[PDB]
Design a protein around this ligand. Structure first.
Ligand SMILES: C=CC1=C(C)/C(=C\c2[nH]c(Cc3[nH]c(/C=C4\NC(=O)C(C)=C4C=C)c(C)c3CCC(=O)NCCS(=O)(=O)O)c(CCC(=O)NCCS(=O)(=O)O)c2C)NC1=O
Ligand SMILES: CC(C)CCC[C@@H](C)[C@H]1CC[C@H]2[C@@H]3CC=C4C[C@@H](O)CC[C@]4(C)[C@H]3CC[C@]12C
Length: 1388
């Protein structure tokens, strides 16, 4: 075809037959120079016009640009000399043509390198992929010329000496091409990096070298680009969301996935051509060791075939680690981009949803549209390409298997398919025992809150074991659903790890039995064993996949129902800037529901600007409905409302955001010190701020849990007053505040002399005191304005207002942590679940090492001389090594389950049995948030997530030490290569683990603020739309998502810089081993090559999962650090001591204090400073003093809650310090200031130990006056108590506590303000019962009510930790001491 073109033979096929093969020199200069040049010249126009359009300011010429230009200049000089030496010196066309095309091209390249100067990415994929294409194409000529020269045929040294230097530049320009850091454009180097630095993710080394030294912060992670930010995603999505939704409503007389495929169809198609290439390049290696096995079988083949399959087996496995990791970033970027156009598009819809179509949603569930329905669409697009990629890796891996083992392989496939039913029935039954366990996961935590919230009371009585066994007995019913759950995940893996071992036994055992003439070779047994690994995963995830898109089809149905909802109608409310009146009602009627009668009927009302107006009426008259209509919340039946100026709104239920007091009051407005202080004093908030430790900066909890109801209302009012709007709408703002405060607020804020004098004010109030100062009063009756007028006018009319007014008036006259878990499992049980794993790695090396000794038969016997006597010891002994792994992978996976739900049983058990024995100081110091997390989020990992991670590390680590024992026993010289690779792998261990942990703990840290914020804007939505501040919240939810993307996307590309360096170590091992099966081809059998290479081909998958399961064992093993720090905290004195007192002790109830001293903490000053007193038998004593004088402190000393710093306490002649704590506590009784009641039945709260009969309990209740109330209950003593007794009145709880005291009948009783929060009638009942029933017991009373103490035999005055006076009440009253002054101040 081209013979005359070169004048030499073109493609003499015999050139590729001799032991010294070489391509014809004409072919190299005829087809290996047009592939590269053809690639460029055919494609330069696209990459030159495309850059002119996207023009940018020229960058400063850096050194690398000039150098890249000089060298391309040389290729012009060297491409011109070549032509010169031809014209100057009969030559063929090829001798002067190809030289010219270099000059023509090198100019074009010299220009394209100049054009990139006006682009962000200097070294694009175009010219950085033409050097590769011209170095792997111009290297077949760097050998033909060099081989020719070495034979003394230096008759072409002119053309050769040029090519040997021109080719030395293409491999030097490429090196300069990879480097691209020539600016700081883009805060992230992701967009300035070159091609060879964007496919290997080598621009990510800066983050890793930064997080390895320090702890990463949100600033060390660069922001995402502009094409990925939220304000841009919600822009592209919007134009498609509405169009499909628009036509979706057309057919009404499913739209979300049409508006999500259209928005991203340049990433579904861009990453569809990389999963398709990855599938083409995944069956190359399985079909490329079929030659290294045949090659090693024969010692006659040529060496050049040996090294050409050891290079294409490393160059075709290097392109598949880039076409893949460059595909995993296109799929994992479309997930964080499909949950950001749905997160940021649900928020934007929360602010414009008709409240008629919002009451059907609950704030607890509308928030879940961002937490489970928008993250179930993030996890479906991450692997949405396995719908066709797992049907193409199956249709192919079954075809390539068929070509080798024929129809017999259907038996092999028939086994894997029969695992799909087992992988879908043990996954369903796994969810059942998981969700079924959520009941005991929650109700277990519910109780723990009660124990911690009220531990002080729990320690007063001997109720510790009562509650210690309540949780323990409540946990055994959870482990049984855990031990039975860890056995359903160690059987779904055991059937996945043993799948390739069972198919290999069935397939061969049927190939060599179903028919004679079938003999195994190394080209059938070892190239099909590595074909059962390509088909293992695609065929063992379909049940898990198609059950995860059908689960995401019920979530897209929710968003499709929320986003495509109705919109609030504001047509009724008109806004006119020229309107004379501030507000006006023109026959306006509003109804909450279209099917419900209007709550506001034909209201005609006109309001002038600046007027203070009050609306009054009976409860349920529609007052709150009127204010709702003003905001546009209520639906219009007929009429309209005209409004002029901005509107402020104060809800009856005050809505407080999460943040500081200063933040809520400002509400996004600039801070003005002068105005801000004026509002606080006007709002009477200064006293409130002073009490708070942080003042105006004090952080507000969820829904103002730290603030009182009256407080919240003032803050809500302060917010409106500060904002300074034209119209004010108030909904009973003074109901929750005191009368005097209301007067101050009204006079300084709402009244004619207040701050809002010049602004229109509407005040819906139930208080009739402010009406005389109101400009106009409106009376609402049955949804209609019954009467309207000024205060004096209404009184004269003698209407309903006067009638109601008269009615109102008539009523007014590290490795330690890794051991603590490991020891808990039982070191004995750890020897048998690591010996049974290593014995599986010894039946694996034996199972394949036996197959290499089986395929050797083909080289000895044949189809004729292969007896059944010898053909059965092979298929038999292989069927015994195929179940010798099935009784060590099953004996090591069950015994592991029993060892991981027993270490959890003995970690919670110790923790719960230690904090319950901790000194009171420990509980007060640490917040309840911590102690309740060591049972919520920590014991929830030691149970479920840590067991599954330590099991996949032992099975992985032994999966690589076994594969390094096969690769090494064949060629021992390979051992010296592992050391260079081990350092590379160990160095990647340190860098990835250090930085991957810090980035997925910066993901959860800022994953909730998206949701926590979403609760605020949806619960307090009506307030936001009132101020028109619904546009500073979109920008506040497009900034709480952009702060997550920067942390989620910075972790997605941290498993890419890894997967490319661990698929370059397990891929550099299938090379440095396949390249020693050719050097030593004279000693290695054909069988041994498959025995070694068929394993090394899957050392890249196993190396990744040993470095990712080494990262979860470092992020989850933190849990065991906290569960152990608390378990080893200091404890109180032993509950029971050898020196038990007599059973009747105490007999007289005498108490003696001897210079007693106590301090709350070692670092805090003494609370009591030498207390010395004697209390006689049956002596009634009252304790009085100023707050903080140590009154309540004395009680703690009696119960030994606070250990003595000095002195001693003796009861009935025995020092309490020598007695066990419980023995002392069971014989003392205290009625607490706060009557805390735990959840459960009344019987349990009264007698948790169940040591008493119902009759005694009923008798105690009768003495407590609670018999009637308890009898009235349907369940009686079995009546359930809510948390903290929220269903019982404060007096009822206190009476119930009295029931506890009357039951115990202790000789010593202590009353600590038992009647501070008790009404007089119940207080007298308590006193009467105490006086009668406890007349024969020593009673010590602490009370702020002196009259309750005048009956005491003696009264002690405590001040600053010292007893000043001690005597009878009469004697003290005669002496003008502190007691006299307090009694005088009390009116006595
Ligand atoms: C857990 C949710 C879930 C997922 C994520 C899922 C699909 C799915 N699951 C996995 C991971 C996976 N799981 C298993 C075993 C199981 N699969 C189960 O459903 C169960 C219960 C088990 C437990 C035995 C294996 C063996 C692998 C890795 C497989 C592999 O090596 N792939 C190479 C690339 S290729 O094959 O795709 O070409 C992948 C591969 C993605 C990957 O390579 N790494 C994860 C992302 S990244 O780290 O790189 O950033 C995919 C597409 N199906 C599901 O139900
Ligand atoms: C979302 C959660 C529940 C799933 C993630 C857990 C994954 C990463 C775990 C679960 C089971 C694990 C596999 C268990 C056993 C083997 C066989 C071994 O020779 C290679 C690794 C491999 C294939 C493990 C890789 C990691 C693995 C796939």
């Amino acid at each position: 075809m081209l013979e005359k073109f070169c004048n030499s033979t073109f493609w003499n096929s015999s050139f590729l037959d001799s032991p010294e093969a070489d391509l014809p020199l004409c072919f190299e200069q005829t087809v290996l120079v047009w592939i590269p040049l053809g690639y460029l010249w055919l494609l330069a126009p696209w990459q030159l016009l495309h850059v002119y359009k996207s023009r940018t300011k020229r960058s400063s010429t850096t050194k690398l640009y000039l150098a890249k230009q000089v060298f391309v200049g040389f290729l012009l000089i060297l491409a011109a000399i070549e032509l010169a030496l031809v014209l100057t010196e009969t030559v063929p066309a090829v001798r002067y043509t190809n030289p010219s095309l270099y000059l023509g091209t090198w100019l074009l390249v010299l220009l394209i390198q100049y054009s990139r100067q006006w682009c962000v990415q200097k070294n694009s994929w175009f010219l950085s992929l033409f050097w590769i294409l011209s170095i792997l194409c111009g290297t077949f000529q760097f050998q033909t010329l060099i081989r020719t020269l070495l034979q003394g045929d230096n008759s072409n040294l002119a053309y050769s000496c040029l090519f040997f230097i021109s080719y030395g530049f293409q491999i030097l320009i490429l090196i300069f091409s990879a480097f691209s850091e020539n600016n700081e454009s883009s805060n992230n180097p992701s967009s300035i990096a070159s091609f060879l630095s964007s496919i290997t993710y080598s621009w990510y080394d800066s983050i890793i070298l930064k997080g390895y030294k320090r702890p990463l912060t949100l600033e060390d992670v660069w922001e995402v680009d502009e094409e990925m930010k939220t304000k841009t995603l919600v822009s592209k999505f919007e134009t498609h969301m509405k169009r499909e939704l628009q036509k979706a409503r057309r057919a009404l007389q499913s739209w979300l996935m049409k508006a999500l495929f259209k928005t991203f169809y340049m990433v579904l198609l861009k990453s569809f051509l990389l999963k398709l290439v990855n599938d083409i390049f995944t069956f190359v290696s399985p079909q490329l060791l079929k030659l290294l096995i045949s090659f090693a079988s024969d010692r006659d083949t040529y060496l050049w075939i040996g090294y050409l399959c050891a290079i294409l087996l490393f160059t075709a496995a290097l392109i598949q680690s880039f076409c893949l990791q460059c595909y995993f970033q296109l799929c994992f970027k479309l997930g964080v981009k499909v949950r950001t156009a749905i997160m940021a598009s649900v928020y934007k819809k929360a602010l414009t949803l008709s409240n008629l179509a919002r009451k059907e949603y609950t704030v607890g569930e509308t928030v879940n549209l961002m937490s489970v329905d928008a993250q179930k669409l993030m996890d479906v697009t991450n692997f949405m390409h396995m719908l066709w990629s797992s049907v193409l890796q199956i249709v192919l891996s079954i075809f390539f298997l068929w070509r080798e083992l024929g129809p017999s392989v259907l038996a092999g496939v028939g086994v894997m398919v029969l695992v799909i039913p087992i992988n879908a029935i043990l996954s369903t039954k796994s969810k059942t025992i998981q969700v079924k366990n959520m009941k005991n996961k929650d109700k277990r935590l519910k109780i723990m809150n009660e124990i911690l919230s009220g531990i002080k009371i729990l320690k007063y009585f001997a109720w510790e074991p009562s509650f210690r066994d309540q949780v323990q007995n409540l946990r055994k019913k959870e482990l049984k659903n855990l031990l039975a759950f860890s056995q359903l995940q160690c059987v779904v893996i055991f059937v996945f790890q043993l799948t390739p071992v069972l198919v290999s036994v069935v397939t061969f055992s049927v190939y060599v039995l179903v028919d004679s003439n079938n003999i195994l070779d190394a080209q059938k047994a070892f190239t099909s064993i590595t074909l059962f690994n390509i088909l293992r995963f695609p065929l063992s995830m379909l049940p898990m996949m198609i059950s995860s898109m059908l689960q995401a089809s019920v979530s897209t149905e929710r968003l499709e129902k929320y986003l495509g909802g109705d919109d609030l109608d504001t047509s009724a409310i008109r806004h006119d800037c020229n309107f004379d009146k501030a507000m006006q009602f023109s026959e306006a009627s509003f109804t909450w529901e279209h099917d419900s009668e209007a709550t506001v009927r034909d209201v005609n009302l006109d309001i002038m600007a600046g007027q203070l107006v009050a609306v009054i009426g009976p409860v349920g008259s529609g007052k709150s409905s009127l204010i709702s209509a003003m905001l546009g919340e209520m639906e219009n039946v007929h009429g309209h409302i005209t409004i002029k100026g901005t509107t402020a709104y104060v809800p009856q239920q005050s809505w407080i955001q999460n943040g500081t007091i200063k933040d809520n009051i400002l509400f996004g407005t600039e801070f003005n010190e002068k105005r801000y202080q004026q509002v606080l004093e006007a709002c009477a908030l200064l006293p409130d701020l002073e009490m708070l430790p942080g003042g105006d900066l004090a952080e507000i909890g969820e829904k103002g849990i730290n603030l009182s109801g009256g407080q919240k209302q003032r803050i809500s009012l302060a917010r409106a007053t500060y904002q300074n709007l034209d119209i004010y709408l108030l909904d009973d703002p003074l109901s929750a505040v005191d009368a005097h405060v209301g007067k101050h607020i009204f006079n300084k804020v709402l009244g004619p002399n207040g701050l809002l004098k010049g602004k229109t004010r509407l005040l819906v109030t139930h208080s009739m005191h402010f009406l005389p100062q109101v400009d106009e009063i409106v009376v609402l009756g049955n949804g209609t304005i019954v009467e309207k007028g000024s205060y004096s006018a209404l009184l004269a009319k003698k209407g309903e207002f006067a009638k109601n007014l008269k009615t109102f008036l008539r009523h007014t006259g590290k490795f330690s942590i890794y051991l603590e878990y490991l020891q808990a499992i039982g070191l004995f049980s750890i020897f048998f679940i690591i010996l049974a794993f290593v014995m599986n790695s010894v039946a694996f090396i034996g199972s394949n090492l036996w197959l290499s000794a089986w395929t050797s038969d083909s080289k000895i016997f044949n189809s004729t001389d292969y007896p059944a006597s010898q053909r059965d010891m092979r298929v038999g002994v292989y069927g015994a090594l195929g179940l010798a792994q099935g009784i060590f992978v099953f004996i090591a996976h069950f015994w592991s389950a029993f060892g991981f739900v027993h270490a959890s049983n003995i970690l919670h058990k110790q923790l719960l049995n230690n904090i319950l024995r901790a000194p009171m100081r420990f509980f007060d110091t640490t917040p309840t948030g911590r102690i309740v997390n060591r049972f919520a989020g920590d014991i929830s990992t030691v149970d479920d997530t840590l067991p599954q991670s330590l099991r996949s590390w032992i099975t992985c680590f032994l999966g690589i030490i076994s594969t390094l024992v096969m690769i090494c026993m064949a060629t021992p010289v390979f051992t010296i290569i592992v050391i260079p690779l081990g350092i590379i792998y160990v160095s990647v261990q340190m860098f990835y683990v250090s930085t991957s942990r810090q980035l997925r703990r910066l993901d959860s840290v800022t994953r909730s603020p998206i949701y926590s914020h979403f609760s605020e804007t949806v619960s307090g939505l009506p307030v936001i739309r009132a101020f028109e501040h619904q546009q500073r919240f979109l920008k506040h939810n497009e900034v709480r998502i952009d702060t997550n993307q920067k942390c989620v996307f910075s972790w997605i590309t941290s498993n890419r810089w890894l997967a490319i360096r661990l698929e370059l170590v397990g891929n550099l091992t299938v090379f440095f081993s396949a390249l020693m099966m050719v050097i030593y081809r004279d000693t290695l059998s054909g069988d041994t090559v498959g025995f070694v290479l068929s394993n090394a081909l899957n050392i890249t998958q196993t190396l990744n999962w040993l470095v990712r399961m080494t990262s979860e064992i470092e992020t989850n093993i933190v849990a065991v650090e906290r569960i152990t720090e608390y378990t080893k905290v200091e404890n109180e004195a032993p509950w029971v001591t050898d020196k038990r007192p007599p059973p009747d002790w105490p007999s007289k109830g005498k108490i003696q204090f001897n210079n007693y001293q106590v301090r709350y903490r070692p670092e805090l000053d003494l609370v009591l400073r030498g207390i010395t007193c004697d209390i006689g038998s049956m002596e009634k004593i009252g304790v009085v003093g100023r707050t903080g004088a140590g009154k309540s402190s004395l009680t703690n000393c009696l119960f030994r809650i606070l250990e003595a710093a000095g002195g001693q306490i003796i009861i009935d002649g025995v020092d309490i310090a020598s007695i066990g704590l419980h023995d002392l506590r069971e014989k003392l009784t205290i009625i607490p200031q706060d009557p805390i009641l735990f959840s459960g039945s009344l019987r349990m709260n009264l007698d948790p130990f169940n040591n008493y009969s119902d009759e005694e309990i009923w008798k105690a209740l009768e003495l407590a006056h609670l018999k009637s109330f308890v009898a009235s209950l349907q369940l009686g003593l079995s009546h359930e108590v809510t948390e903290a007794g929220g269903n019982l009145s404060i007096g009822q709880r206190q009476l119930l506590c009295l029931g506890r005291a009357l039951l115990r009948k202790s000789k010593i009783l202590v009353l600590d303000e038992a009647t501070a929060a008790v009404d007089l009638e119940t207080d007298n009942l308590i006193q009467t019962t105490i006086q009668n029933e406890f007349a024969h017991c020593t009673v010590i009373t602490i009370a702020h009510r002196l009259h309750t103490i005048m009956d005491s035999d003696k009264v002690m005055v405590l001040d600053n930790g010292k007893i000043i006076e001690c005597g009878s009440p009469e004697e003290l009253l005669q002496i003008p001491g502190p007691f006299y002054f307090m009694a005088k101040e009390a009116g006595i």
